[PDB]
Amino acid sequence: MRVLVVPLPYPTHLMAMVPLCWALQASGHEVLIAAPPELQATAHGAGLTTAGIRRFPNPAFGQRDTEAGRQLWEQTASNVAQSSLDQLPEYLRLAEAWRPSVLLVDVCALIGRVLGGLLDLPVVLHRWGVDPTAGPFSDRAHELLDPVCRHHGLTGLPTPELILDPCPPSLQASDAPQGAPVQYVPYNGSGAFPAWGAARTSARRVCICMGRMVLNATGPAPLLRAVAAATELPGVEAVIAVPPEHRALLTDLPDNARIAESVPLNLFLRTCELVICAGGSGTAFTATRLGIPQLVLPQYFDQFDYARNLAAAGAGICLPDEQAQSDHEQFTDSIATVLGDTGFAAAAIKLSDEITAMPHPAALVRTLEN
Amino acid sequence: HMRVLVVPLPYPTHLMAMVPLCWALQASGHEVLIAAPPELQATAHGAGLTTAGIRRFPNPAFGQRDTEAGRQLWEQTASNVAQSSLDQLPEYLRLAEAWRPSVLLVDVCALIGRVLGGLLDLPVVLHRWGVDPTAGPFSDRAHELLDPVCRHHGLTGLPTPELILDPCPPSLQASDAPQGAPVQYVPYNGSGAFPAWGAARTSARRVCICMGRMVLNATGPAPLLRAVAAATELPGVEAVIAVPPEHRALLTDLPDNARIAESVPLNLFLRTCELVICAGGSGTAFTATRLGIPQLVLPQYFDQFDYARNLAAAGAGICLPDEQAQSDHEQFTDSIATVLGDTGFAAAAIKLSDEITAMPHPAALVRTLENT
Ligand SMILES: Cc1cn([C@H]2C[C@H](O)[C@@H](COP(=O)(O)OP(=O)(O)O)O2)c(=O)[nH]c1=O
Ligand SMILES: Cc1cn([C@H]2C[C@H](O)[C@@H](COP(=O)(O)OP(=O)(O)O)O2)c(=O)[nH]c1=O
Ligand SMILES: OC[C@H]1O[C@H](O)[C@H](O)[C@@H](O)[C@@H]1O
Ligand SMILES: [Mg+2]
Ligand SMILES: [Mg+2]
């Protein structure tokens, strides 16, 4: 196979596919990443090769039955459809040059389904996490991209061959069509094993990690409310994982607090009792895979679903909206509840077990073959 | 479930040789950590891997292990590696205690990994990067210097490895290298970008020149400058020169029929090339061989003479075996013309490529490591 990988221009979506890209390559197949500038460093930082392509929190994301919730998801499909069309010439040329035989495509990167349709190539969708694109998004996607595909002789945007799904079924949106399961492998970037990452401490270790993309969109509030909530509680040791660009957000920290700057989470998370995060699937799924419960402050897109379904399975707590997130008493009480009740860790382990019972990226390569 | 600690020598290409196996391990749910000195940090991270921090030419005597001078060169290499093993054992023991690996994946030359395996009673899987000339003089000096050491810790002597993994095409492997289990070479040449011109050949005769960073640091400019002059003088030739950034200031007044490809992964374009001119480092040379591309090899050190000799005997290239040959411009030019005028070189290189493709993929080797 020559597998051309087409993600939306968000690091997490491409990182979700990185262990499968590596399984494909360790299996003999070729792999190229269609990468806009926002994905270049991510792609290369995983040892992969590329072709160059040129308000919060908002709970309505998690409410597709609302007027506002329907509108947000349609608006996303509309923006993506538009730029898919803008970019189709470029992607056609790339496919001419490199001649892929399969397209491995982000569920949200519609460009990929059009390309599959137009070039008659089989299309393998890949979910990055909780997938809430049924209904509003997917309907709007057909209504906008149906025409171009019919112009080329198809009935419409086609249904994909296969949809790979790293999300444990238990957490998956209830209306997401059946995918083919694949075990989540926590790829969190390259980096260094920290000395203190080897064992827990007598302290209650709490990791805060909001990721780059979230805070650029939200401003510092969710990180800084998390730091305020965690360090207040007696006996907690805060581990704060930030990219270099957000290190200066952190001014006055207690003495036992640790700044972990660009340190892959999976390297130390097992020494932690709690993750405070925003529901971004790279931090969140690495925690759940390592059986660590979470306190989730969702902001946008699929984060509210993930936080809801996580809490429903008992493996964490959601702060659902601006009223909850801005309330230091609820924030701190939520941390104290998780630390004081080992039923959270127990639920989280149960989910870790759901994940590790799933076929690994290695096993999926044969599915892709067929 | 394994926790695999990887113990390379501080040479990028030895680590790069293991990158596809590391990916395979991770892709099948295991954990992998690279014990990296400073020189390895960027290669490990550049492949997506995580690290624990640690810490004249050509010379034909390297392929003359049956002579005094050859034996001395491999012995000093084993001496240097044994001495660093004693320097660094304390960090490695602290790391193994910290991370608790269940198996060590060790560069054949990284003597520390065998010591560590002995001391902590962990299986050691050795990994060759290519042709392995370490039997006899190197291995003897290793046992001589480390046997007493491992005895001082209650062991038998430097342990025998549980398993040796070998990507080298078997018809090209040193005759005295002990048997290793086959693992198919996958061309990992680093990250980077698909060049527009790499899609298809042109009417020109495309010849890639790639000497690696390691080589040019040791040799200076000569082998590059020799290959550029020899290739661009021949009429009909287009030279694609793969150079890392710190070496690009070596080329000046580049002719019209020369192209600089700075850190572009070879596998991205190599299929459009009719010949590869290199020093015989396995990353360049196995990528070429994998693609059935013949090579003109200017060996300089270590395993390069053996690879160059054995590739020439297979018919899959030409060796310039020493300084008088590599600096004979007219013989160098004639050798390029010879390969370009005779498709038998390519056909011989496809035969070697069929050996590689008969080897199990890194993915299949995951099962073997689990059973070790
Ligand atoms: C800042 C930081 C991120 N990461 C990783 C965790 C995830 O794999 C990824 C961030 O993904 P994620 O949490 O999904 O979303 P976003 O990047 O918008 O926040 O980066 C670390 O492992 N360590 C760090 O210090
Ligand atoms: C300089 C350069 C190297 N490479 C790769 C090919 C090999 O995988 C690796 C070099 O390794 P190798 O040829 O084994 O030895 P040395 O580094 O001393 O020449 O770097 C490229 O793909 N493109 C480049 O431009
Ligand atoms: O599972 C049911 C709920 O999940 C979805 O994610 C929607 O946003 C909400 O409309 C729906 O009622
Ligand atoms: Mg405060
Ligand atoms: Mg043999």
Instruction: Tell me: cis bond preceding B58? Omega within 30 of 0 counts.
Output: yes
Ligand 2 centroid distance, CA of B192 (Å): 13
Note whether B26 contacts A25, CB cutoff 8 Å.
Answer: no
By what technique were these coordinates determined?
X-ray
C-beta of residue B361 within 8 angstroms of C-beta of residue A27: yes
Annotated binding residue B192 = no
Tell me the two tokens of residue A40. Answer: 């270049």
Q: Compute CA B303 distance to the chain's CA centroid, rounded to the nearest angstrom.
A: 9
Among candidate residues A348, A221, A334, A224, the one with its CA nearest the CA of residue A284: A348
Burial of B322 (C-beta count, 10 Å sphere; 0-12/13-18/19+): middle
Domain shared by B107 and B230, yes or no:
no
Q: How many CB atoms lie within 10 A of CB A54?
A: 7
Rounded-to-integer distance, Cα B48 and Cα B42, Å: 10
Note whether B366 contacts A362, CB cutoff 8 Å.
Answer: yes
Domain shared by A325 and A188, yes or no:
yes
Ligand 2 centroid distance, CA of A32 (Å): 19
Rounded-to-integer distance, Cα B360 and Cα A303, Å: 42
Q: How many CB atoms lie within 10 A of CB B64?
A: 14
Ligand 3 centroid distance, CA of A166 (Å): 20
Tell me the two tokens of residue A172. Answer: 């998956």
C-beta of residue B36 within 8 angstroms of C-beta of residue B54: yes
Backbone phi, psi, residue B357, to 5°: -70, -10
Burial of B130 (C-beta count, 10 Å sphere; 0-12/13-18/19+): buried
Domain shared by A365 and A235, yes or no:
no
Rounded-to-integer distance, Cα B301 and Cα B280, Å: 9
3-state secondary structure chain A: CEEEEECCCCHHHHHCCHHHHHHHHHCCCEEEEEECHHHHHHHHHCCCEEEECCCCCCHHHHCCCCHHHHHHHHHHHHHHHHHHHHHHHHHHHHHHHHCCCEEEEECCCCHHHHHHHHHCCCEEEECCCCCCCCCHHHHHHHHHHHHHHHHCCCCCCCCCCEEEECCCHHHCCCCCCCCEECCCCCCCCCEECCHHHCCCCCCEEEEEECCHHHHHHHCCHHHHHHHHHHHHCCCEEEEEEECHHHHHHCCCCCCCCEEEECCCHHHCHHHCCEEEECCCHHHHHHHHHCCCCEEECCCCCCHHHHHHHHHHCCCEEECCCHHHHCCHHHHHHHHHHHHCCCHHHHHHHHHHHHHHCCCCHHHHHHHHHC
Domain shared by A347 and A366, yes or no:
no
Q: Which residue of B has its CA nearest to A191?
A: B50
Note whether B24 contacts A20, CB cutoff 8 Å.
Answer: no
Atom of ligand 3 nearest to the CA of A62: 8
CA angle B61-B63-B68, nearest 5°? Answer: 45
Q: Is the CB of B339 under 6 A from ligand 2?
A: no
Rounded-to-integer distance, Cα A268 and Cα A201, Å: 12
Q: What is the largest CA-CA distance in chain A?
A: 66
Instruction: Tell me: cis bond preceding A57? Omega within 30 of 0 counts.
Output: yes
Interface test with B, best of A18, A32, A42, A44 (most B CBs within 10 A): A44
Do the strands B163-166 and B124-127 form a parallel or antiparallel pair, or are they unpaired? parallel
Domain that holds residue B328: 184-360
CA distances to A42, A103, B41 from A11, rounded to whole Å, are 6, 18, 22
Domain shared by B158 and B203, yes or no:
no
In DSSP terms, which residues pair with B50 in a beta bridge?
A191
Annotated binding residue B217 = no
Annotated binding residue A279 = no
Q: Identify all chain B residues contacting A195, using CB atoms and an 8 Å cutoff.
A: 98
Note whether A192 contacts B28, CB cutoff 8 Å.
Answer: no
C-beta of residue B185 within 8 angstroms of C-beta of residue B251: no
Domain shared by A193 and A146, yes or no:
no
Atom of ligand 2 nearest to the CA of B265: 22
Ligand 2 centroid distance, CA of A127 (Å): 35
Q: Identify all chain B residues contacting A360, using CB atoms and an 8 Å cutoff.
A: 27-29
Q: What is the largest CA-CA distance in chain B?
A: 66
Domain shared by A355 and A252, yes or no:
yes
3-state secondary structure chain B: CCEEEEECCCCHHHHHCCHHHHHHHHHCCCEEEEEECHHHHHHHHHCCCEEEECCCCCCHHHHCCCCHHHHHHHHHHHHHHHHHHHHHHHHHHHHHHHHCCCEEEEECCCHHHHHHHHHHCCCEEEECCCCCCCCCHHHHHHHHHHHHHHHHCCCCCCCCCCEEEECCCHHHCCCCCCCCEECCCCCCCCCEECCHHHCCCCCCEEEEEECCHHHHHHHCCHHHHHHHHHHHHCCCEEEEEEECHHHHCCCCCCCCCEEEEECCCHHHCHHHCCEEEECCCHHHHHHHHHCCCCEEECCCCCCHHHHHHHHHHCCCEEECCCHHHHCCHHHHHHHHHHHHCCCHHHHHHHHHHHHHHCCCCHHHHHHHHHHC
Rounded-to-integer distance, Cα B84 and Cα B230, Å: 41
Q: Which residue of A has its CA nearest to B188?
A: A47
State the sign of the Cα–Cα–Cα–Cα dihedral A217, A220, A225, A227: positive
Among candidate residues B209, B285, B192, B195, the one with its CA nearest the CA of residue B251: B209
Q: Is the CB of A188 under 6 A from ligand 1?
A: yes
Q: Is the CB of B118 under 6 A from ligand 2?
A: no
Number of domains in chain B: 2
Note whether A47 contacts B23, CB cutoff 8 Å.
Answer: yes
Ligand 3 centroid distance, CA of A104 (Å): 27
Backbone phi, psi, residue A294, to 5°: -130, 150
Tell me the two tokens of residue A58. Answer: 């908002």
C-beta of residue A287 within 8 angstroms of C-beta of residue A269: yes
Which of B9, B11, B13 has the most ligand 2 atoms within 8 A of CB, as the residue to mutate? B13
Q: Is the CB of A243 under 6 A from ligand 1?
A: yes
Q: Compute CA B228 distance to the chain's CA centroid, rounded to the nearest angstrom.
A: 23
Rounded-to-integer distance, Cα B15 and Cα B11, Å: 7
| Residue nearest atom 3 in ligand 3 by C-alpha distance | A63
Q: Is the CB of A239 under 6 A from ligand 1?
A: no
Domain shared by B97 and B148, yes or no:
yes
Cβ-count burial A288-311 (b if 16+ within 10 Å, e if not): bbbbbbbbbbbbbbbbbbbbbbbb
Q: Which residue of B has its CA nearest to A19?
A: B27
Q: Cα distance from A327 to chain B (closest Cα, Å)? A: 38
Note whether B29 contacts A190, CB cutoff 8 Å.
Answer: no
Q: Which residues of B touch A (CB under 8 A)?
A: 19-21, 23-24, 26-29, 31, 33, 44-53, 98-99, 184, 186, 188, 190-194, 196, 199, 265, 267-268, 361-363, 366
Annotated binding residue A188 = yes
Q: Identify all chain A residues contacting B23, using CB atoms and an 8 Å cutoff.
A: 19, 22-23, 25-26, 47
Among candidate residues A160, A62, A186, the one with its CA nearest the CA of residue A106: A160
Q: Which residue of A has its CA nearest to B265?
A: A49
Q: Is the CB of B195 under 6 A from ligand 2?
A: no
Q: Cα distance from B33 to chain A (closest Cα, Å)? A: 8
CA distances to A60, A111, A143, A150, B237 from A74, rounded to whole Å, are 12, 16, 10, 21, 55
Instruction: State the angle between helix axes of A37-45 and B38-46 in degrees (0 to 180), rounded to the nearest 10.
Output: 120
Q: Identify all chain A residues contacting B24, using CB atoms and an 8 Å cutoff.
A: 22-23, 26-27, 362
CA distances to A154, B131, B328 from B57, rounded to whole Å, are 64, 20, 15
Rounded-to-integer distance, Cα A20 and Cα A162, Å: 15
Q: Cα distance from A69 to chain B (closest Cα, Å)? A: 36
Domain shared by B120 and B19, yes or no:
yes
Q: What is the CATH number of the domain that holds B55?
A: 3.40.50.2000
Ligand 1 centroid distance, CA of B293 (Å): 41
Domain shared by B97 and B206, yes or no:
no
Tell me the two tokens of residue A305. Answer: 């679903």
Domain shared by A161 and A295, yes or no:
no
| Residue nearest atom 11 in ligand 1 by C-alpha distance | A282
C-beta of residue A331 within 8 angstroms of C-beta of residue A325: yes
Rounded-to-integer distance, Cα B91 and Cα B68, Å: 36
Rounded-to-integer distance, Cα A39 and Cα A348, Å: 31
Q: Cα distance from A353 to chain B (closest Cα, Å)? A: 13
Cβ-count burial B188-199 (b if 16+ within 10 Å, e if not): bbbbbbbeeebb
Rounded-to-integer distance, Cα B20 and Cα B320, Å: 31
Q: Compute CA B113 distance to the chain's CA centroid, rounded to the nearest angstrom.
A: 19
Domain shared by B126 and B209, yes or no:
no
Q: Is the CB of A298 under 6 A from ligand 3?
A: no
Tell me the two tokens of residue B253. Answer: 């007044």
| Residue among A25, A48, A361 whose CB faces B186 most closely | A25
Rounded-to-integer distance, Cα B209 and Cα B194, Å: 18
| Residue among B27, B52, B190 whose CB faces A26 most closely | B27
| Residue A349 identity (one-letter amino acid) | I
